[PDB]
Scaffold this active site. Structure first.
Site, PDB file in Angstrom:
ATOM      1  N   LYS A 102     -24.520  32.897 -13.720  1.00 17.34           N
ATOM      2  CA  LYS A 102     -24.792  31.681 -12.685  1.00 17.34           C
ATOM      3  C   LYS A 102     -23.691  30.372 -13.333  1.00 17.34           C
ATOM      4  O   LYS A 102     -23.646  30.073 -14.693  1.00 17.34           O
ATOM      5  CB  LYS A 102     -26.320  31.544 -12.693  1.00 17.34           C
ATOM      6  CG  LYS A 102     -26.513  30.741 -11.227  1.00 17.34           C
ATOM      7  CD  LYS A 102     -26.494  31.417 -10.486  1.00 17.34           C
ATOM      8  CE  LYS A 102     -26.965  30.503  -9.400  1.00 17.34           C
ATOM      9  NZ  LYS A 102     -26.825  31.136  -8.228  1.00 17.34           N
ATOM     10  N   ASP A 142     -23.075  28.603  -3.297  1.00 16.52           N
ATOM     11  CA  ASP A 142     -24.376  28.562  -3.460  1.00 16.52           C
ATOM     12  C   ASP A 142     -24.947  27.599  -2.860  1.00 16.52           C
ATOM     13  O   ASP A 142     -24.279  26.709  -1.994  1.00 16.52           O
ATOM     14  CB  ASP A 142     -25.112  28.294  -4.976  1.00 16.52           C
ATOM     15  CG  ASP A 142     -26.273  29.656  -5.305  1.00 16.52           C
ATOM     16  OD1 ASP A 142     -26.973  29.731  -4.239  1.00 16.52           O
ATOM     17  OD2 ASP A 142     -26.648  29.853  -6.276  1.00 16.52           O
TER      18      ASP A 142
END
Length: 416
Positions: A102, A142
């Protein structure tokens, strides 16, 4: 309540339902690598501003880590770490050769210019180059980040790498013109539809003529309704947005609903549709309910009032654990949130495979491979559900943690 602590508590809850050594659990409770870098860019006014960037690689036992990049003013290291931990199980439940990763930048992109956004992406790549790569860490689109930023990031990575390898495969979600993949736009909705079909098949029900209600009318809910109507033949009877919702028993056509929303500002005042609020939609008697909106929407307050036979958690965690237990006691089949929306990461993996191989597939091939992956993953989770007599969410956690633990044991990282 910190997000990483929430993720660790969830992981411990899952672990007390399975046989896992203490050392492996302690290893899984800690991200294997966290990188925090400063991202300096030149603003349009000539000044230089420094942003905070993150890149967390939770675990790479199964392969290179995977995860998106967020550009949100509320970004914190805890959120990135928790999302990397969640991504580990998300890629493990689908049986992909990926780990958990991430990234994020503490920035408000609404006040950044086109040029400034490009500079931010390029500077982030220049800062995190040493920990990313086609076989090390593959970023993805994202929240507040789009495929255009993916193309910029890939171009910067290729410039730094001097074209010594598959620079297309370093990042996914790219535009079709540069290493892009077909079927990326409808990946999450396609996965959700496949999981819904498999759940209905397992329950022994027919989708043809069944009602569906979708909460949230973004890019995941609208495609979900569309593909539900086409593939499953279901009658879409209710859709909703943040502002409000609508309901019409005879059936809704999502195309003009989206047109209206992108022309009016919200999905309401539809002809022949009763204006209802999100809570009325949630308690509406349907066969499949697909919350595709803000998280924590089905709580213990309205858990009993839910009448949908199948609840597809397209969004990230829309059901609280107590409401989850209540729904389980009512005979309601819940598809785990990180299992239902796993189509996006699967299509991202397909894009990475295409980039690595240098050969690109068609829409039909991508669609059939996604169907196979989702069917196998859902049946694995359901078989664990029936064998261990535990919760479906718990079954998915058991499957993911078991796969990661086996990968760790095979590498020799943990001796038990």
């Amino acid at each position: 309540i910190d997000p990483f602590e929430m993720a660790v508590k969830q992981l411990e809850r899952a672990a007390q339902y399975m046989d896992i050594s203490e050392e492996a659990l302690e290893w899984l409770k800690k991200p294997m690598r966290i990188v925090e870098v400063s991202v300096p860019i030149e603003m349009d006014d000539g000044s230089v501003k420094v942003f905070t960037g993150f890149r967390v690689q939770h675990n790479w036992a199964r392969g290179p880590t995977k995860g998106g990049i967020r550009w949100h003013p509320a970004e914190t290291l805890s959120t990135v770490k928790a999302l990397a931990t969640w991504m580990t199980w998300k890629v493990a439940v689908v049986d992909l050769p990926y780990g958990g990763g991430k990234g994020g930048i503490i920035v408000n992109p609404k006040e950044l210019s086109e040029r400034e956004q490009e500079r931010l992406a390029r500077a982030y790549i220049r800062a995190v180059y040493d920990v990313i790569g086609p076989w090390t860490d593959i970023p993805a689109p994202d929240v507040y980040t789009n495929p255009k930023i993916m193309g910029w990031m890939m171009d910067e990575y290729e410039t730094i790498m001097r074209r010594k390898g598959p620079a297309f495969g370093v990042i996914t979600g790219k535009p079709l013109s540069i290493g892009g993949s077909l079927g990326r736009g409808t990946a999450t909705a396609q996965g959700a539809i496949f999981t819904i079909r498999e759940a209905a098949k397992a329950l022994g029900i027919d989708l043809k003529g069944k009602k569906i209600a979708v909460q949230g009318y973004g890019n995941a809910g609208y495609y979900t309704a569309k593909l539900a109507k086409e593939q499953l033949g279901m009658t879409v009877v209710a859709v909703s947005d943040s502002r409000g919702g609508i309901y019409n028993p005879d059936g809704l056509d999502p195309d003009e609903v989206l047109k209206w929303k992108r022309e009016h500002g919200s999905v309401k005042d539809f002809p022949g549709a009763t204006n209802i609020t999100n809570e009325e939609l949630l308690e509406l008697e349907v066969d499949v309910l697909a919350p595709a909106a803000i998280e924590e929407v089905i709580t213990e307050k309205n858990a009993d009032n839910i009448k949908a036979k199948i609840v597809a958690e397209v969004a990230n965690g829309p059901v609280t654990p107590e409401a989850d237990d209540i729904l389980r006691e009512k005979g309601i089949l819940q598809i785990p949130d990180f299992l239902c929306n796993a189509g996006g990461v699967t299509v991202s993996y397909f894009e990475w495979v295409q980039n690595i191989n240098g050969y690109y597939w068609t829409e039909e091939e991508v669609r059939e491979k996604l169907d196979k992956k989702m069917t196998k993953a859902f049946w694995e989770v359901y078989n664990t559900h029936k064998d261990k007599n535990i919760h479906m969410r718990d079954a998915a956690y058991v499957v993911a943690v078991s796969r990661v633990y086996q990968a760790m044991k095979d590498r020799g990282w943990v001796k038990k």
